[PDB]
């Protein structure tokens, strides 16, 4: 039982960790560009998209490795919990 609760909790915890950094940078870029467009009055609306695409892709390059190490370790763990009973 507690193994079930633990594994289910951890799933949500990993979602949170992995998704957190891209969504942070997409937020910060959204705020900065929105402010800049009030500091100098320009009514463009694709500029956020153009910048935040580069912003998100860059950090996907950076974190490409840790993403695979975390998921491998988790998969091995849950396969053990499922099968290794005696």
């Amino acid at each position: 039982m507690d193994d079930l609760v633990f594994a289910g909790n951890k799933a949500l915890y990993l979602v949170l960790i992995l998704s957190g950094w891209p969504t942070i940078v997409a937020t910060i870029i959204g705020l900065l560009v929105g402010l800049f467009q009030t500091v100098t009055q320009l009514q463009e609306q694709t500029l956020p998209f153009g910048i935040k695409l580069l912003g998100v892709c860059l950090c996907l390059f950076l974190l490409s490795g840790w993403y695979g190490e975390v998921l491998l370790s988790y998969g091995r763990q849950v396969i053990f919990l499922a099968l290794a009973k005696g």
Binding site: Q77, F80, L81, A84
Partner: protein, 183 residues
């Protein structure tokens, strides 16, 4: 007078003074406040003082405890970190309890950290414990090891007398007479 050390802490200074006095070296402690303490000696004793500071590696480094590496200021901490803080607090509480037993002056305790492979799916491993203690002079150490083992055995859920190591020692001779002043 020649300067040996500057900017010491109070508990560094008293240790240095103690070790110099033991070898018959008269030393002086001076307080500069925000600059800390300074230690000075006479020239005839300078050579010896230097050699002893080398041999004992003074001033002492601060005391290490595992909870310092997992500050609990995290956003969130893994099971591994929580289980470490827990064990590191039990070690300190046991050392403080032993210091209350009859005639013990000081002690040190160590516990096997099962945390090394906590949370890899595998079951936990039995615990091991080690203790050091210092006694007053004229104590029957052999008869006193039993009490310590007995006390430690039931502090943990699964411990065997075979898994408890205890090392005891007596206090050294008292340093009561003052050192002689250089001629």
């Amino acid at each position: 007078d020649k300067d040996l050390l500057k900017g010491l802490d109070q508990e560094q200074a008293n240790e240095v003074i103690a070790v110099l006095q033991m070898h018959n070296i008269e030393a002086n402690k001076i307080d500069s406040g925000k600059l800390g303490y300074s230690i000075t000696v006479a020239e005839p004793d300078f050579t010896a003082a230097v050699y002893w500071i080398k041999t004992y590696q003074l001033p002492p480094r601060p005391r290490v405890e595992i909870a310092q590496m997992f500050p609990a200021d995290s956003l969130v901490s893994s099971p591994r970190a929580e289980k470490a803080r827990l064990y590191s607090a039990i070690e300190q509480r046991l050392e403080q309890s032993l210091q209350t037993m009859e005639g013990v002056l000081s002690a040190r305790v160590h516990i096997s950290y099962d945390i090394d492979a906590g949370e890899n799916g595998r079951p936990p491993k039995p615990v091991h414990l080690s203790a050091l203690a210092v006694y007053e002079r004229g104590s029957p150490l052999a008869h006193q090891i039993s009490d310590i083992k007995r006390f430690l055995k039931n502090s943990f859920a699964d411990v065997d007398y075979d898994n408890i190591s205890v090392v005891l020692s007596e206090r050294s001779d008292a340093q009561l007479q003052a050192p002689g002043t250089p001629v």
